[PDB]
Amino acid sequence: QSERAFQKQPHIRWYKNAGLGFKTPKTAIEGSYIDKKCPFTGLVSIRGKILTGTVVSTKMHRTIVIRRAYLHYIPKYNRYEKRHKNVPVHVSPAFRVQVGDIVTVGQCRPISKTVRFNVVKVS
């Protein structure tokens, strides 16, 4: 689990808890995974709001592309055209998310150009 230089390690194995109703799996408390930006050990802290939806693609690593269809009460043509949204998300050592898989994410500390959300739950 070390394919890059420069002392791949936690930055002070290490373990913390964001709290607020989201579990930390036992390999993510005491396991060999580094958890650089997975918020359970991580360097990031949790805040903001939590969004939920199924996925479209998980092709690249550390990219979870959620879909999010939601109801909105349209008054214009008085029928509901169905919503769709997208958000990239970093991995977690709890679930290899495949197609389907309604999961939720919490807002924190922009990681790439467009990701502020990291997976905290699978159900």
Binding site: L20, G21, G48, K49, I50
Partner: protein, 229 residues
């Protein structure tokens, strides 16, 4: 160019008084010029309200603070020496600043919502409020959104009101701004529309936020006196 909270008549002028910086924010306060001059009318213009500020009649929160645009926000007890004027100003039911008149044993204190508790430096517990009174050493069971009671002679917390299900809460913020009745429901969500819900005359229901609500007492016994109609 005015907000809604000041109860400001439109036939007044063109430039509206921006409050200066201070304890509260700009959006949740009224300065002393809009307090004294054109609300309870102890002045007629800015010159003579500056004159009585130089005379130093005002004693808001037990200190003088001679300034025209001093942002008196929620329940800062305005104290005026002549005719022993003690004024606690709270929110009415339609968004304005209802300035209730109180007495000396009630103006000897105020209360404040706690915002955060910190292990800041050198092992010192720590508490802030909406006027920012960084007072030393409360108990460990100060959560967020509880209510301290400030001493107003020194600064110490004298009494403490715990935030839980079944407490008398005041809502300052959003579309519920200035309501009282605090019990139909409790619902703590995980990031928004999370609150304790407030009754009406027919005990209707309401939604707000945690930070937009703060406790003032118990179900029938607040030690704040409140105005009536």
């Amino acid at each position: 160019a005015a907000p809604h909270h000041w109860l400001l008549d439109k036939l007044s002028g063109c430039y509206a008084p921006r409050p200066s910086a201070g304890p509260h924010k700009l959006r949740e306060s009224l300065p002393l010029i809009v307090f004294l001059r054109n609300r309870l009318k102890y002045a007629l213009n800015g010159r003579e309200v500056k004159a009585i500020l130089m005379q130093r009649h005002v004693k808001v929160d037990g200190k003088v603070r001679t300034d025209t645009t001093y942002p008196a926000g929620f329940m800062d007890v305005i104290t005026l020496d002549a005719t022993n004027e003690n004024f606690r100003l709270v929110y009415d039911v339609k968004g304005r600043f209802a300035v209730h008149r109180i007495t000396d044993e009630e103006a000897s204190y105020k209360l404040g919502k706690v915002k955060k508790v910190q292990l800041g430096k050198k092992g010192v517990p720590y508490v802030v409020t909406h006027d920012g009174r960084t007072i030393r050493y409360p108990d460990p069971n100060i959560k967020v959104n509880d209510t301290v009671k400030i001493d107003l002679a020194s600064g110490k917390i004298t009494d403490f009101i715990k935030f839980d299900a079944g407490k008398l809460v005041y809502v300052t913020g959003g579309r519920n701004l200035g309501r009282i009745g605090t019990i139909v429901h409790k619902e703590r969500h995980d990031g928004g529309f999370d609150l304790v819900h407030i009754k009406d005359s027919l005990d209707n229901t309401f939604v707000t936020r945690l930070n937009n609500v703060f406790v003032i007492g118990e179900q029938g016994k607040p030690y704040i006196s409140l105005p009536k109609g």
